[PDB]
Amino acid sequence: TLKSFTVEKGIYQTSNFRVQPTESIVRFPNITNLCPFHEVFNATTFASVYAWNRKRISNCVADYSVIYNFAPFFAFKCYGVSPTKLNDLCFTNVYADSFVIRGNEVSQIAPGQTGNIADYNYKLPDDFTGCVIAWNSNKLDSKPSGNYNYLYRLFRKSKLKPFERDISTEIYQAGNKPCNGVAGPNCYSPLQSYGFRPTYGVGHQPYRVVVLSFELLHAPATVCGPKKSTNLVKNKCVNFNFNGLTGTGVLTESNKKFLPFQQFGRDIADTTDAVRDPQTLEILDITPCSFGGVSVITPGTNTSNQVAVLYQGVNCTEVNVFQTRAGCLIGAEYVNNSYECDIPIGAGICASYQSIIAYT
Amino acid sequence: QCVNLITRTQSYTNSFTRGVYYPDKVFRSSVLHSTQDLFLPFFSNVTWFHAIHVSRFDNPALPFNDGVYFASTEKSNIIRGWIFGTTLDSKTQSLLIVNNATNVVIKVCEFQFCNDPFLDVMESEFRVYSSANNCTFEYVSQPFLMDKNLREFVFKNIDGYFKIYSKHTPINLERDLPQGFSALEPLVDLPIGINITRFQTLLALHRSYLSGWTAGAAAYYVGYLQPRTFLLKYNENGTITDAVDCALDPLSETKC
Ligand SMILES: *[C@@H]1O[C@H](CO)[C@@H](O[C@@H]2O[C@H](CO)[C@@H](O)[C@H](O)[C@H]2NC(C)=O)[C@H](O)[C@H]1NC(C)=O
Ligand SMILES: *[C@@H]1O[C@H](CO)[C@@H](O)[C@H](O)[C@H]1NC(C)=O
Ligand SMILES: *[C@@H]1O[C@H](CO)[C@@H](O)[C@H](O)[C@H]1NC(C)=O
Ligand SMILES: *[C@@H]1O[C@H](CO)[C@@H](O)[C@H](O)[C@H]1NC(C)=O
Ligand SMILES: *[C@@H]1O[C@H](CO)[C@@H](O)[C@H](O)[C@H]1NC(C)=O
Ligand SMILES: *[C@@H]1O[C@H](CO)[C@@H](O)[C@H](O)[C@H]1NC(C)=O
Ligand SMILES: *[C@@H]1O[C@H](CO)[C@@H](O)[C@H](O)[C@H]1NC(C)=O
């Protein structure tokens, strides 16, 4: 500090003592109001690909772990986002689209793909942000007589735009002559039936597909991943994250009676002095960890190399140890005798070299 | 089923020191805190509306402006909620707040509102709106109109959140905008994210069963918030017991 190899006799303020944080405590409100993924990925009846079901998802917590563990998935392809980061991301809206297709066409449910399903039944945009999930549904959707309740659109005048649905059953007119709304030669009904049977090859077995589309808008994002409760540790210097408010401090018990709306507390000087725990509605007094001004008391180097350390403002129990009003003095022995001041320690206490002694 | 039944008259009164609310959720004890926010100015001009139905359209939609201070001395049953929006038709989203004794339902949908919307008592919302479509929000909670008693609300639409503040202050023979300070506790913060420029009050009408509806009167006060700097006094327990409006007069300005 003094930029010299020889130190003159005196007390020099050289450093700041700090109490290092020991643990990290993150307290967040209880997980509740989870998004109804269990009603999308586990439905008694799914929908035809032409009349694909769309559920808007808003104002809930998105627990994707239940989606992960629901079934073994033929594809969990995610476009524009990684699967792991989804929980730590918060999106304004989540759209869940549910339909049943044959296995061969599962590849068609992707950006930039072509087929009967992509052109005429369900289309994803090139810039799509979301995931496509598919799983086998032989037990649920296959009958030996044949399941004729799943339909697809084979014929349409123009390709579908992304996120568009056509429910029209109008006869597809492939020829110059008018159909007249009655099926006739060169006139074919657009919706064909997926005649699912249990003994079909894996390419043709029914597969249930759920498409999750995530969109962000200027409105505040209200669908975000689960918040970890973690645990609460008190009476120690721990880094605290309470509802996105961060710091480092001891959390002692509080006698302050908060009103129910209030969540945080502030000092006269606009520094946080209190908080309400989200998990349990209790009030805690946030006190920052101890700090001190480390001062080195030394005589001249030539005379001796012994030093004493004064922690300014720090009680002795929080760091030849003596307690002074100035702070805790370590390395000097208190002597009852009174002498003239040689090195001032403050608060009526002075130090001298005879070992290093401290006296009034 | 839209019918015009309500006629409205208006008078002017003094705000006094009503309309103070807690600007944030921070607990402050034994301090003087100066905050700049949308507040109702002290001793401002407040419109007193008398809505009468006796057994043509005379109940126009009020402008929301930057926020609204609402007060009523009527019982909980007569006034049942509010309507918020811009066009108040199917094209744009709208916010409907409806209270009944068991609970409060706050719902945001594309309501095609009637010119004179009222809840008729079972309770039917057919009068309130002909149709509701593309509904995007629903929140159900304990009611804030419960049972002489002056009920005060402050509505703000800031940064896509609809902040609602409320207080229930008993009053005696003294005029319905009383003296003194009743700080308004924050009640419900809603992430509606919609544009609100106009609002209307919802009243309840009873069927006559004998002049289809029973005759009724409702009195309510509307004031408008302005961007103002206030100095609030926080006591030992965190309650706001006093405030000074800085721009109102030189003495308060010196205090601020
Ligand atoms: C008061 O409002 C609540 C909420 O709108 C009504 O409660 C609902 O009543 C319907 C009956 O049509 C039930 O299907 C719902 O399950 C109820 N919801 C809740 C949250 O309870 C209640 O009926 C209304 N009371 C009156 C007298 O109108
Ligand atoms: C999921 O589907 C199976 C099929 O029978 C059922 O047993 C289970 O209860 C369902 N789980 C949920 C959470 O719906
Ligand atoms: C959250 O969980 C705790 C412990 O399970 C419980 O005591 C508390 O009532 C719950 N709810 C809230 C709003 O804190
Ligand atoms: C309130 O406004 C009305 C018209 O807007 C006006 O006539 C009246 O004088 C105002 N009140 C006061 C106290 O200025
Ligand atoms: C609103 O409703 C109409 C008819 O129900 C529909 O055409 C339109 O796409 C809807 N818009 C949204 C955003 O849901
Ligand atoms: C809010 O609505 C008003 C009334 O239609 C309109 O003039 C204004 O431009 C709207 N604000 C925005 C940001 O769209
Ligand atoms: C504040 O709380 C204390 C403790 O409950 C109570 O005695 C006192 O009356 C309250 N009000 C004021 C103005 O101090």
Task: Indicate the helix (H) or strand (E) that contains A345.
Answer: strand A343-346
Contacts of B193 in chain A (CB under 8 A): 218-220
Output the furthest CA–CA distance in chain A (Å, rounded).
123
Report CA dihedral (B183, A280, A57, A88) to the nearest 10 degrees. Answer: 110
Run of H or E including B252: helix B250-255
Task: Output the CA–CA distances (angstroms, integers) from residue A219 to A222, B137, B155, in the order listed.
Answer: 9, 13, 19
The phi-psi region of residue A146 (left if phi > 0; otherwise alpha if psi is between -120 and 50; otherwise beta) is: left
Tokens 């390395």, residue? A331
Using CA atoms, how far apart are residues B218 and B202, in angstroms rounded to an integer? 10
CA B154 to CA B166: how far, in whole Å?
6
Element (H, E) at A117: helix A116-120
Q: Which ligand is nearest to the CA of B140?
A: 1
Structure token pair of residue A203: 């390419």
Is A303 exposed, middle or buried, given 0-12, 13-18 or 19+ CB atoms closer than 10 A?
Answer: exposed
Q: How far apart are CA B148 and CA B153, in angstroms?
A: 16
Name the DSSP class of B40: P
**Under 8 Å between Cβ of B245 and B226:** no
Within 10 angstroms of residue A320's Cβ, the number of other Cβ atoms is: 13
Q: Which atom of ligand 2 is nearest to the CA of A39?
A: 14
3-state secondary structure B41-96: CCCCEEEEEEEEECCCCECCCEECCCCEEEEECCCCCCEEEEEEECCCCCCCCEEE
Return the HEC string of A212-231.
EEEECCCCCCCEECCCCCCC
Rg (CA), chain B: 19
Distance, CA of A348 to CA of A354 (rounded, Å): 19
CA proximity to A226, closest of A75, A88, A98, A359? A88
Which of B201, B151, B148, B199 has the alpha carbon at shortest distance from B18? B151
Strands B26-27 and B7-14: unpaired
* Specified resolution (Å): 2.9
How many CA atoms are closer than 13 Å to the CA of B124, on its beta-carbon side? 11
- Cβ of residue B191 closer than 8 Å to a chain A Cβ: yes
* Helical ranges in B132-201 per DSSP H: none
Experimental method: cryo-EM
Amino acid residing at A351? A
* Secondary structure (DSSP) of A227-271: PP------SS-EEEEETTEEEEEEEEE------SS--EEE-TTS-
Enter the tokens of residue A26.
Answer: 């993150």
Which residues have a Cβ under 8 Å from the Cβ of A26 and sit 6 or more positions away? A228, A230, A240, A241
What is the C-alpha separation between B99 and B114, in angstroms, rounded?
18
Residues of A in contact with B136 (CB under 8 A): 56, 58
Instruction: Pick the atom of ligand 6 nearest to B87's CA.
Output: 5
Question: B235 CB under 6 A from ligand 7?
Answer: yes
**Looking at chain B, how many residues does it have?**
256
Cβ-based neighbour number of residue A26 at 10 Å? 17
> Burial code of A34-61, b = ≥16 C-beta within 10 A, e = fewer?
ebebeebbeeeebbbbbebbeeebbebb
How far apart are the CA of A195 and the centre of ligand 1, in A? 44
Going by C-alpha positions, the residue among B95, B114, B124 that lies closest to residue B57 is B114
